[PDB]
């Protein structure tokens, strides 16, 4: 108990181990059943503790390495009268273990914490109430994106519709993907050198318009 | 009536029970994940113990634990002991606990919300004001009316566009 699984969960996993022991027992060896059953029972209990206790599941060999690191640090602190540094632990772990490896193994073993962890004496606050949402764009971001699209269309209208269309096809404004020169040339019916040339001249006219009006500079961050 | 008995337990969309990385690079997550994990572990172990033909006592215990898992998931602490994470007396927050109460969904996020274009400060008597007036600090009003201010700055020459004005006010 107290290793991350309920009493009943441990009991059911030991029941699975007991079923295995039953199906693998050989009475001919004159051994009592308990001696063979205890092996599989401990085996199943430990497999369950290793496989289910963590909210972020860790492979069983990695959990064994983590527990070895735990025991090692605990013996080192029981002999040192203080918590050991990464370097002392890497020493005691043997070869192939440098301090950076101990640090990475500890970072990989960090368990998550509850978003419902309380803050304060009277339960008026949660821990999740301080986590900003980074994924969904802010109104400022969406507004800047819309103004960018509108300014790019404002600048793309100063081109002819063909050079504007070539730029839009080549950069992905139209269908979401960027086409090769051969595809834009097969669409407009022109050589890849010609389509790349009108792309260059459209970019050049846009560069001139931008040096003149400076309307798109502020969007470059 | 038989629909009051569950065959397929629904699972909440994951964004409403997030698994997010906080500032320091560590992870914070909702209790519904641990409740669902309890449920799925017990249900999978039941499916296996059935596939292997286990005795009656064992399947009975497994089914009892499965019911109590579903109960903790839907309304923890309602029947029996509340399900707590290891090393803590704190009950886990089930769906019932998310809906009902002072901090529940209705009272906390639906009948009242935190809101944009809002501020607060210490009050002061100001007897020169007419009845229809109040004294608003300049910086408070700048932030509260910020988009209007960006627009009016673009109308005048104070900035080339909205984004330049915002960077200038930063």
């Amino acid at each position: 108990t107290g290793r991350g699984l309920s009493f009943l969960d441990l009991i059911q996993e030991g029941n699975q181990g007991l079923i295995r022991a039953v199906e693998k027992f050989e009475y001919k060896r004159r051994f009592k059943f308990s001696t063979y059953a205890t092996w599989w029972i401990r085996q199943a209990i430990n497999r369950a503790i290793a496989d289910q206790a963590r909210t972020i599941r860790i492979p069983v060999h990695m959990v064994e390495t983590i527990n070895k690191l735990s025991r090692t640090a605990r013996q080192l602190q029981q002999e040192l009268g203080r918590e050991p540094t990464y370097e002392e632990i890497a020493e005691a772990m043997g070869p192939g273990w440098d301090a950076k490896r101990v640090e990475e193994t500890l970072k990989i073993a960090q368990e998550p914490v509850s978003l419902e962890t309380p803050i304060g004496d009277e339960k008026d606050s949660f821990y999740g109430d301080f986590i900003p949402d980074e994924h969904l764009p802010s109104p400022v971001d969406a507004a800047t994106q819309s103004l960018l699209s509108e300014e790019l269309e404002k600048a793309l209208s100063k081109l002819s519709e063909r050079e504007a269309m070539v730029l839009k096809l080549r950069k992905g404004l139209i269908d979401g993907r960027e086409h090769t020169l051969e595809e834009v040339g097969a669409f407009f019916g022109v050589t890849r050198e010609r389509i790349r040339q009108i792309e260059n001249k459209a970019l050049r006219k846009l560069k001139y318009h931008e040096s003149r009006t400076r309307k798109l500079r502020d969007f470059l961050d | 009536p038989e629909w009051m008995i569950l065959e397929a337990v629904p699972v909440l969309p994951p964004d409403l029970r997030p698994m997010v990385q906080v500032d320091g690079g560590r992870f914070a997550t909702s209790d519904l994940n641990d409740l669902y994990r309890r449920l799925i572990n017990r249900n999978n172990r039941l499916k296996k113990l059935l596939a292997q033909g286990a005795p009656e006592i064992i399947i009975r215990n497994e089914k009892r634990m499965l019911q109590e898992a579903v109960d903790a998931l839907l309304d923890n602490g309602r029947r029996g002991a509340p399900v707590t994470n290891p090393g803590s007396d704190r009950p886990l927050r089930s769906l019932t606990d998310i809906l009902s109460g002072k901090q529940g969904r209705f009272r906390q996020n639906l009948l009242g919300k935190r809101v944009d274009y809002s501020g607060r400060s210490v009050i002061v008597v100001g007897p020169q004001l007419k009845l229809h007036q109040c004294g608003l600090p300049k910086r408070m009003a700048l932030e509260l009316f910020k988009p209007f201010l960006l627009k009016k700055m673009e109308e005048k020459g104070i900035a080339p566009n909205v984004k330049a004005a915002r960077r200038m006010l930063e």
Binding site: F7, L8, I11 | I57, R60, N61, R64, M65, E68, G80
Partner: peptide
């Protein structure tokens, strides 16, 4: 009332 007590009783029958 206590599921582990119930199971320990069921175990005590066999």
């Amino acid at each position: 009332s206590d599921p582990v007590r119930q199971y320990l009783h069921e175990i005590g029958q066999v």
